[PDB]
Scaffold this active site. Structure first.
Site, PDB file in Angstrom:
ATOM      1  N   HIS A   1       2.148  63.297 -16.226  1.00 41.48           N
ATOM      2  CA  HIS A   1       2.496  63.859 -14.957  1.00 41.48           C
ATOM      3  C   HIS A   1       3.607  63.487 -14.356  1.00 41.48           C
ATOM      4  O   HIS A   1       3.802  62.322 -13.706  1.00 41.48           O
ATOM      5  CB  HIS A   1       1.481  63.817 -14.219  1.00 41.48           C
ATOM      6  CG  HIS A   1      -0.136  63.843 -14.396  1.00 41.48           C
ATOM      7  ND1 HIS A   1      -1.278  63.262 -14.367  1.00 41.48           N
ATOM      8  CD2 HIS A   1      -0.555  64.763 -15.631  1.00 41.48           C
ATOM      9  CE1 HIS A   1      -2.071  63.446 -14.862  1.00 41.48           C
ATOM     10  NE2 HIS A   1      -1.903  64.532 -15.550  1.00 41.48           N
TER      11      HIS A   1
ATOM     12  N   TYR B   1      -0.997  52.436  -6.570  1.00 42.93           N
ATOM     13  CA  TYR B   1       0.353  52.853  -6.673  1.00 42.93           C
ATOM     14  C   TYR B   1       0.823  53.191  -5.126  1.00 42.93           C
ATOM     15  O   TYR B   1      -0.145  53.686  -4.520  1.00 42.93           O
ATOM     16  CB  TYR B   1       0.686  53.519  -7.728  1.00 42.93           C
ATOM     17  CG  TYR B   1       0.061  55.133  -7.940  1.00 42.93           C
ATOM     18  CD1 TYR B   1       0.605  56.114  -7.164  1.00 42.93           C
ATOM     19  CD2 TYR B   1      -1.148  55.042  -8.371  1.00 42.93           C
ATOM     20  CE1 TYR B   1      -0.177  57.297  -6.984  1.00 42.93           C
ATOM     21  CE2 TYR B   1      -1.959  56.502  -8.324  1.00 42.93           C
ATOM     22  CZ  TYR B   1      -1.447  57.801  -7.789  1.00 42.93           C
ATOM     23  OH  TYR B   1      -1.897  58.800  -7.881  1.00 42.93           O
TER      24      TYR B   1
END
Lengths: 194, 194
Positions: free
Chosen positions: B73, B137
């Site tokens: 992605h 993240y």
């Protein structure tokens, strides 16, 4: 009481400035995902703009085993505390700021579905309840020699503190944490120290 | 080594703007600590100041089990990816940006001692190698309808991609990921559109 919560914040009335957040966690025991921090959504819930005022950012992570007990440390910066894995801790706070809330406490279980905003001046600690835990936090300042005098510490085992630990007998504690002063010997952090 | 590395950055020459970091992790099997991200230390190593330009910040965590395979992605935002627990993933990237490096790939094992900066427009994915992993993240933008054109996707199993996954037979892949388009059907993302 873990999955699917609505993102929300509650003040901790005993410790001005502290906030407890419910974090949406989606999935089940096999795996999940969360938005652990989202600045645009958390500002309107009361996450303080002052956190961002200097543009400073650091993320620390510690990976710790059951019964490890760290604290109680009031480092000279604000903190956003979370858990990144499936573990859990008994989070513990003692306000070390000079004023009417000096010595006030709060405790709660921190897992991936709960985070905590801790203002500078409030001592932070935890005991690991799960077999292991990934403890992930954000801070808004960096270590500097000039900040050293602005730390305060209080002993996890001072029995006069309005806290209890999960397993004091089997706690795994650093030599430094064994030797922090009891509350009676803490110099309260003044406005000039914050 | 996992422990005791010097903080360092290496460019990923196949994907302009990508950076791989060694993160100092202190401790051992029983427990450890790291500065996962320290902005003042990272900027002089090449972490781009542009990441912070708009003042946006979000931290996502996914907790995933062995053989889960997610991707590939490319999203509207830059990403700083690491691992917060003792687990590990095979990280995989495909550059989906228009120009000479479209289709270029890189793969490396990410654990708590390594992190990766992924520029917007580079497709990201991972396969979990350990029993579980806490994949944490930081990103620098938020979902908005108007960013829909900034997304691109490419199928993880496209045999033409210069990548290799582990044990594909046992991979746990979402229906959505099984059906992402093949590289030749991906519209390359224009830099001016990012």
């Amino acid at each position: 009481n873990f999955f699917g919560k609505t993102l929300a914040a509650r003040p901790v009335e005993a410790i001005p400035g502290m906030l407890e957040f419910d974090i949406p966690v989606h999935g089940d025991n096999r795996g999940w995902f969360k938005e652990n921090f989202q600045k645009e959504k958390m500002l309107p819930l009361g996450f303080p703009e002052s956190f961002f005022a200097e543009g400073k950012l650091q993320n620390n992570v510690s990976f710790s085993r059951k019964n490890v007990l760290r604290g109680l440390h009031a480092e000279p910066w604000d903190k956003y505390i979370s858990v990144a894995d499936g573990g859990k801790v008994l989070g513990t706070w003692v306000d070390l700021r000079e004023g009417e809330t000096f010595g006030n406490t709060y405790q709660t279980v921190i897992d991936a579905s709960k985070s905590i905003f801790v203002p500078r001046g409030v001592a932070n600690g935890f005991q690991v309840l799960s077999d292991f835990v990934a403890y992930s936090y954000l801070v808004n300042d960096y270590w500097a020699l000039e900040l050293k005098p602005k730390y305060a510490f209080v002993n996890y085992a001072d029995p006069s503190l309005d806290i209890k630990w999960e397993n004091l007998e089997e706690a795994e504690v650093s030599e430094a944490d064994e030797n922090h002063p009891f509350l009676k010997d803490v110099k309260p952090l003044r406005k000039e120290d914050l």
